[PDB]
Amino acid sequence: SVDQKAISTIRLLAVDAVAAANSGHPGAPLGLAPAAHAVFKKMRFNPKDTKWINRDRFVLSNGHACALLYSMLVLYGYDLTVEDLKKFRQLGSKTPGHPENTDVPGAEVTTGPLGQGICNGVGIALAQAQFAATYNKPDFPISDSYTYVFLGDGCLMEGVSSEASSLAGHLQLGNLIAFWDDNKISIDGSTEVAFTEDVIARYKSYGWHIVEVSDADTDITAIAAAIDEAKKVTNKPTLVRLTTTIGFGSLAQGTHGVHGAPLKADDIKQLKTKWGFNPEESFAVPAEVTASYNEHVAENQKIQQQWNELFAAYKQKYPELGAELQRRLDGKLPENWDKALPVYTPADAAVATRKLSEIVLSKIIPEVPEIIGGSADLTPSNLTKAKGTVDFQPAATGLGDYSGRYIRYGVREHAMGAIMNGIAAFGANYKNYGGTFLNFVSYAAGAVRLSALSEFPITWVATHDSIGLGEDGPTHQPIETLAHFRATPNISVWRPADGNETSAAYKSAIESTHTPHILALTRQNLPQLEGSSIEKASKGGYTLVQQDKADIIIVATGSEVSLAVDALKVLEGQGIKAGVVSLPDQLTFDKQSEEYKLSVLPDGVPILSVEVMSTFGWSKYSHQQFGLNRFGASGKAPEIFKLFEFTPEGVAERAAKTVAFYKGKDVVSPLRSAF
Amino acid sequence: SVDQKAISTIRLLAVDAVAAANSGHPGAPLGLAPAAHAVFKKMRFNPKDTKWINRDRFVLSNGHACALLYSMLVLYGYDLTVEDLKKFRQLGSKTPGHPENTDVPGAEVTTGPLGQGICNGVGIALAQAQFAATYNKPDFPISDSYTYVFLGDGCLMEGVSSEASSLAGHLQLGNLIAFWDDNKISIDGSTEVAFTEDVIARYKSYGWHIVEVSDADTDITAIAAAIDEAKKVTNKPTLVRLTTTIGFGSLAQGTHGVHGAPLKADDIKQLKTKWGFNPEESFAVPAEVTASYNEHVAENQKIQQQWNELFAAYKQKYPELGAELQRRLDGKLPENWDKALPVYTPADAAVATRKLSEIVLSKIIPEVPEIIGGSADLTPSNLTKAKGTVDFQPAATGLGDYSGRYIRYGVREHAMGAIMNGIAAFGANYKNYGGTFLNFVSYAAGAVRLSALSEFPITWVATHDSIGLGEDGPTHQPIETLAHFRATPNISVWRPADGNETSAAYKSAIESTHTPHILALTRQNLPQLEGSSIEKASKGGYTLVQQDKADIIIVATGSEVSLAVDALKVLEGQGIKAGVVSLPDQLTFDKQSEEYKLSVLPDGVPILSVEVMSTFGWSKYSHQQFGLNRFGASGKAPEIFKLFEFTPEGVAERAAKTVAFYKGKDVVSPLRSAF
Ligand SMILES: CC1=C(CCOP(=O)(O)OP(=O)(O)O)S[C@@H](O)N1Cc1cnc(C)nc1N
Ligand SMILES: CC1=C(CCOP(=O)(O)OP(=O)(O)O)S[C@@H](O)N1Cc1cnc(C)nc1N
Ligand SMILES: [Ca+2]
Ligand SMILES: [Ca+2]
């Protein structure tokens, strides 16, 4: 039949791509081609408009299987061709060895690190539910799309997927439909060696609906029926068990050897002849398959055409909501939204930056509807919920509504990070955030790194940033954490010192379109600084205290800026004149012009950094570094600062030693380099 | 009764400790005191010998509840007193705000980061099973101890605990008995807001046995009976559901407010009078409670006395095993074990460092019985299994035996990391390891950091270290990873360049007693270096190529050392004389004498670092840094190195620019500092 021919075409495109690269993963593509065919036939999408907001989304969580995804995208006439398939896994191609949303049209998210994609799918589905609750009206189903996810045994073993699956079940996300590739093979062989749990029973325990397809190597009728069944269960996410043979059709089917290396040439020949293809030909695309797939595209395009007319009629019936929706689909924040950001003067009281963050959120959430966010069971500690908002919960629980704006993630940092990526991936200008203690952002590193690689404007509200948290002690006190994330490409790591800097950090985080943000915030109160402003802090680094005859410049962040200012006064009594630089975000600073940066960190003066965590990275900006390169302690925070000599006198002593060390030396800016 | 008085004593010690600190967590201690009393009465332990190898182990996974643990340890006469309780959460005390194994007698592991302790308990139980299978003989139950773990809702939400619980069920670890504090309260309030899964059904799906105690606020008879029941189920780990009231007895019982802040003074008074204590008194220890607890200690000490005689008789009946066991309990490796380490010359073939690692393991595993380890579903990629060894599996599966040495962790990096910590915590000189790709060690950061803080000699076999892995692309290629772990205190991060350096890295990792190791290993082949040796590489950094008239020194690691040597030859043709330093472990190097370090990185010569990952940290050792501070690419590895100019000519160009940049300047070693 044409459907059988399409499935064979998909299988053989994937195998031929792996063969051409002499690299990659043929097994899961062979096993999942029937399901991919069936799911894409049910999906609504436009290959010529990858951003249609009411499209169904597809996520390949088992991202190593991407020859399958690329084959689907090629067959459906996305901006990806057979010539791109021939360049699978080749430097610079549009067909990288794992899918990247920045590079691959029709890749919603970046997968490959196992477990991430299913969590991203939870976030896409969460966003869709929130979006539909916000905009849909009687006779106006603006948003009614589904989220389809493929995942394998590896994703099911990774703890992040358990976190997200527990939460998705709690949230009753009925438009999420996931498909488990139940092939009983991973890299180490049979799943009997390490993965003998009853997956189905576990998913029932989370509140998911289950459909089992016992012959998913052939039974596309049953796969389609499973989708129809899942769509009828509106208050539970569904897991469809696809019992498949890894490498179906290969001489090596059902073995670990077919997972992750090219097939033998003779194996590819017998695949082709068994399925009616020419064993001498590669990258075959039968015209009847193209015709069948084109019919579905044309139908989908007529659906989008009608949606566009629905949207026009919505703008007439609901003028304010329609304009808001239009603005969001245009990627624009509300005009002058930033006028809501709080501004402070040096006469205002000291405030912890976690509390300044609460105040910002309280002002901007009512003004910017596309802001939603939550906390990983730290709401009263991170201060992430604006008073008067409702939680995102299914109304059936009585605990919230899908129109709500605040997410109770539970103690699930890693899934929170990956769900945030999915909310961003949904689109519609969502600017979403997640709170935890800074030290436990590290639990979510797998997802955080993908925020950076995927260029998603997500925000971590990362409170209790240092030994300043006090008594909880060294298991809670960051040392390495900022260095880790600053060393990752494309992460803005804001460590604001005061009220104006906190507003600048949020301006950056909310305006972002391509860069994730981590906001490192204090437990403890900090003074409002003389010389701070949103304008200056928006440059990432700025001269807080200018001293034309400086003997030294002290560069600091966060809680250590006030310390530097107090040290400047001690130094004055020692006959040493200091300037102070505040560096609330190193990435933003790095992006400023060379001349601006040199105005902050000039030649001809020693520069000392002060930050109560690792000294890694700080030599970019300083000649000498005063940091904390050992674990912390359990005690009252001021006593810990004293123990480690993070006091005005301790900073002044090191500043004086720095001045002495450079006596008789020629000093150039740390910004200078040989290449 | 005396038992009732003991429970009240525990509750009130915990509340009084929190009160004295005006900080900490009274709720779970109040709720779990009956269970703690019951479990400790069943446990075999010696407060005067915390290292008795046949003790039962206890782990408080909900580590914030540590006022409970400290109260138990004080009551039982560990090296912890009421005076220490009065110093709870105070700087320098033996009663930190979360338990630390380095600081607290009777704390087996360091907890506080949720989810870790239960996984550590899985590792203690895994080790006990392996140890018993190795040493027990008829009439000689050398090892027959249990592992008791308390955990809360937060631990159950963290994905790491799902990973470890799936694996523990697969492994049929019948001597593991965990207790869930089912109090339905976390920081954000009721668990109804975020955690509505059927926990019991999930644990059944993993293959655990369940016992439910519906009135765990009072029913110590049922808690004791649950332990007895769990001990009869020898082929399943057991979860005991303890339905408790958080803060039991407080006016604020059953509320989130009792979780994490001191009780009001009037509340403490009414607790005391309800339970027959003097409301004017704090830190009361009734002598009848001490007497009862002392009776159990005395009985346990007679059990250990008899075990010592059993061990003496074992040494007579089984002379070789007995001597091996004695050596391990003395903390000593086999005499001259390191003579098994492979040695290479520059005439030997190029080898990838992952393959060199396989060869090391193959030589040392037969010689050092306390080495066990595994991989997170990457055995044929990491090359972590020695041919001819058997996997650690329950014999009932037919897939291995508990005497086996190789663990199939599945796709569970985070739990693997925390399980490794538990295996180390068991003791008996275990030197255990875990393989994954370097980029996915990051999934396990929560546990890795605790290896460092806990001072456990665990080893990550972290292969596919860089863009050298090629086609899998940027989702798999480390950039930030070494900087992250090098910035963490107390992590040795070895990046060996060749065969001799790989042997030095393993010598360090296996000899370690207090420092975790990460071995960053290549996919791709590297040449054997002229000038390398185990002796020199054991110093962490060494002069590979000495040049008395050097214009520049190039310092490099791993795959970039050979690149530096090739660049030296290009530079010679440009009239520039270079030396080369290899820096296989920065931590080991840092620990050498100042004079040794200066002999490697002297004054008076520019130093350029080369390493194909982040430049963070490298200014400790260099004036200029050539690194990779952007994400990678999907293509054949040599083409990626060329793209980024990590070629002999690209290094030489940057070296020449470095020489030019320092013309006319006075240069001192990067090792010099102002303070
Ligand atoms: C183990 C592993 C794989 C097997 C999947 O086994 P699974 O059953 O999911 O795939 P199948 O055998 O094709 O059906 S792929 C490769 O990613 N990898 C390394 C890998 C490990 N850890 C993480 C976080 N991401 C990864 N990418
Ligand atoms: C959320 C959170 C807690 C509530 C536990 O809720 P749980 O039900 O386990 O404790 P109970 O309410 O006392 O019964 S504690 C504090 O650790 N914390 C922050 C916290 C967050 N993430 C990680 C990895 N470790 C942590 N430590
Ligand atoms: Ca599989
Ligand atoms: Ca709880």
UniProtKB/Swiss-Prot annotation, chains A, B:
It comes from the Eukaryota. The record marks 25, 259 as: Important for catalytic activity. InterPro entries: THDP-binding, Transketo_C/PFOR_II, Transketolase-like_C_2, Transketolase-like_Pyr-bd, Transketolase_bac-like, Transketolase_BS, Transketolase_CS, Transketolase_fam. Substrate binds at residues 25, 259, 354, 381, 464, 472, 523. It holds the Pfam family Transketolase_C_1. Thiamine diphosphate binds at residues 64, 112-114, 154, 183, 259, 413, 440. Its cofactor is Mg(2+); Ca(2+); Mn(2+); Co(2+). It is an enzyme of class 2 (transferase). Its EC number is 2.2.1.1. Transmembrane segments: none annotated. Binds 1 Mg(2+) ion per subunit. Can also utilize other divalent metal cations, such as Ca(2+), Mn(2+) and Co(2+). Binds 1 thiamine pyrophosphate per subunit. GO terms for cellular component: cytosol; nucleus. Keywords: Calcium, Magnesium, Metal-binding, Thiamine pyrophosphate, Transferase. It catalyses: D-sedoheptulose 7-phosphate + D-glyceraldehyde 3-phosphate = aldehydo-D-ribose 5-phosphate + D-xylulose 5-phosphate. The keyword Mitochondrion does not apply. The active site is at 413 (proton donor). GO terms for molecular function: metal ion binding; transketolase activity. Gene3D superfamilies: 3.40.50.920, 3.40.50.970. One of its GO terms (biological process) is pentose-phosphate shunt. The keyword Heme does not apply. Belongs to the transketolase family. NCBIfam families: tktlase_bact. Catalyzes the transfer of a two-carbon ketol group from a ketose donor to an aldose acceptor, via a covalent intermediate with the cofactor thiamine pyrophosphate. Homodimer. This is Transketolase. It comes from Scheffersomyces stipitis (strain ATCC 58785 / CBS 6054 / NBRC 10063 / NRRL Y-11545) (Yeast).
